[PDB]
């Protein structure tokens, strides 16, 4: 029993983390095979970050301008090129700790694990979600860019995020491993705002099934609802619309607990209209929306890697 | 910016995890140098778990009764002995991935990272605290015993917990790496209850300083208090007493934000007497008590390993 914000084991990703220095600027890099991936603003100076033209900045640099360090060993850069917002630095040595990996781009509402790094060294690991406004509520300080978000399936590490910047509100923005930003954010130190965020409804229901699995049933009621009457209340409380595919995804958790999805939606309707009244669900006073249905099945069935 | 439940990188601990089978029972083992550590109830059968005498059960077994698997390789057991509630299985091969490690026992209110494992394979990593009643609120299923809790300092892994059992309330109990249980719990499948838990006050204040560091200041007030008047309110709300040493530990966070500890205690007093009134602190509606002062300094200063 028990339910926690559980992140994937970070060992496979730790072996791919390096430090990339260019001038007075340094950050973290992802070293897979003979290529090192890092955010492109490493070629920026402090005065060249308000309105930078990375095409001009990059051709102004050579291979010897990139200090790549893997622990004590300094990796020799033999090639460099830009792929959207990331830098691909070809090195003369293939990473011997390279796992089976993938470069995927995730959808809002999906989760992943972050390995926050500084100077190429891992500092911590936590779980994150891709918010509907394409931001992430992470924990990042100066020098954390180049940290990656990832999922793990069997032996394969699915890289899905690389850290870049922090928005004025404190939330963070980044790209996939091909360098394409999540959301309408550019890598300039300029005034930028994210779209208004909403609650990931299908994740809240999955988290509610996790509570039922662990003995938390005080929010359950005999009432049911239709998908249309529930969505009319979800829109009023800034929740994402529930689709039939969502009801199908929650199928396994629905059958495992014997609670229909539309029945669980009636409990969510009551929780949204009445609050919790001093109660807690899985040790939380807020409805958690950063657990996918797979996340619940993973935690409550003990899937390993 | 940002504040998350951040766990240590699990790579160093992943390389020490093995699977220990004895009869029809299997669980996880910790392999350091030429010794494998695992909970002692692996030598138990399903019918021998209500009132087991482990001294009798162990002398009834030989070295060949212990199946130790490290990945595909089956480790040859050449010695076995009991140390309180753990089993020490001497093997003919030293773990080449053995890091600099330590066996420490932590105090209630201290935190650590858990690497939940099954069949010797890591499944996830999350952060935990040693509750004042010596329980932990973890996420464990059948077959998770032998998973370890740990902290990391520089290069040294400080092992501080090994998982054993789940109490009827859903909380979990275990031992240090010398086999001595945390709290008044024994490894029998019997009716057992933990002492009433209290809130770790010094952790709540440290978490409040983390909120001030990240721009959350709505709970701050101009009022102050004395250590005695605050503790009189803390006792009414089932909080641990604040000591002068606690005020000294919170020193760094106090000076970094310019908020005296006793001034921050006045904000906690108001939050306890009035609630939050629909507000949130660091994305939470409850006062978090699973962040030590070191945890806050670690997250907000970017300490790596």
């Amino acid at each position: 029993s028990g339910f926690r914000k559980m992140a994937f084991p970070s060992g496979k990703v730790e072996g791919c983390m390096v430090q990339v220095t260019c001038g007075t600027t340094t950050l973290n890099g992802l070293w897979l095979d003979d290529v090192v991936y890092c955010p492109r603003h490493v070629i920026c100076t402090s005065e060249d970050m308000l309105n930078p033209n990375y095409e001009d900045l990059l051709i102004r640099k050579s291979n010897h301008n990139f200090l790549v360090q893997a622990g004590n060993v300094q990796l020799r850069v033999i090639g460099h090129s830009m792929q959207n917002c990331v830098l691909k630095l070809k090195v003369d040595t293939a990473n011997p700790k390279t796992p089976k990996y993938k470069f995927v781009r995730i959808q809002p509402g999906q989760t992943f694990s972050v390995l926050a790094c500084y100077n190429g060294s891992p500092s911590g690991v936590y779980q994150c979600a891709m918010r509907p406004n394409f931001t992430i509520k992470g924990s990042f300080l100066n020098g954390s860019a180049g940290s990656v978000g990832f999922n793990i399936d069997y032996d394969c590490v699915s890289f899905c995020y690389m850290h870049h910047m922090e928005l004025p509100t404190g939330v963070h923005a980044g790209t996939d491993l091909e360098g394409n930003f999540y959301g309408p954010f550019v890598d300039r130190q300029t005034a930028q705002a994210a779209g208004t965020d909403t609650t990931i409804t299908v994740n809240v229901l999955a988290w509610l099934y996790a509570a039922v699995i662990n003995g938390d049933r005080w929010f359950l009621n005999r009432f049911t609802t239709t998908l249309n009457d529930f969505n009319l209340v979800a829109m009023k409380y800034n929740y994402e619309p529930l689709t039939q595919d969502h009801v199908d995804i929650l199928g396994p958790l629905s059958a495992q607990t014997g609670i229909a999805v539309l029945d669980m939606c009636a409990s969510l309707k009551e929780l949204l209209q009445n609050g919790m009244n001093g109660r807690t669900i899985l040790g939380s006073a807020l409805l958690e929306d950063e657990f996918t249905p797979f996340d619940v099945v993973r935690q409550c069935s003990g899937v390993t890697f | 910016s940002g504040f998350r439940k951040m766990a240590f990188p699990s790579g160093k601990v992943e390389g020490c995890m093995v699977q220990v089978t004895c009869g029809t029972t299997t669980l996880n083992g910790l392999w350091l140098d030429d010794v494998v550590y695992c909970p002692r109830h692996v030598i138990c059968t399903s019918e021998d778990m209500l009132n087991p005498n482990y001294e009798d059960l162990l002398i009834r077994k030989s070295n060949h009764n212990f199946l130790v698997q490290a990945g595909n390789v089956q480790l040859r057991v050449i010695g076995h002995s009991m140390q309180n509630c753990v089993l020490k299985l001497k093997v003919d091969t030293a773990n080449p991935k053995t890091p600099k490690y330590k066996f420490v026992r932590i105090q209630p209110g201290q935190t650590f990272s858990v690497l939940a494992c099954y069949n010797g394979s890591p499944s996830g990593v999350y952060q935990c605290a040693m509750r004042p009643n010596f329980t932990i609120k973890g996420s464990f299923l059948n077959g998770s015993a032998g998973s370890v809790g740990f902290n990391i300092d520089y290069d040294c892994v400080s092992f501080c917990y090994m998982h054993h059992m789940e109490l009827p309330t859903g909380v979990h109990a275990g031992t240090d790496l010398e086999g001595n249980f945390y709290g008044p719990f024994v490894d029998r499948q019997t009716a057992q209850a933990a002492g009433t838990d209290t809130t770790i006050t010094v952790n709540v204040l440290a978490w409040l300083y983390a909120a001030v560091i990240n721009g959350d200041r709505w709970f701050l007030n101009r009022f102050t208090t004395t250590l005695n008047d605050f503790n009189l309110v803390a006792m009414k709300y089932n909080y641990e007493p604040l000591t002068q040493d606690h005020v000294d530990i919170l020193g760094p966070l106090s000076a970094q934000t310019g908020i005296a500890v006793l001034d921050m205690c006045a904000s906690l007093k108001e939050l306890l007497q009035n609630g939050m009134n629909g507000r949130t602190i660091l994305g939470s509606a409850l006062l978090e008590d699973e962040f030590t002062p070191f945890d806050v300094v670690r997250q907000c200063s970017g300490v790596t390993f």
Binding site: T26, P39, N142, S144, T190 | -
Partner: peptide
């Protein structure tokens, strides 16, 4: 109140 590119040290 502008964004921050999070490189350099720490």
């Amino acid at each position: 109140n502008v964004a921050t590119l999070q490189a350099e040290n720490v």
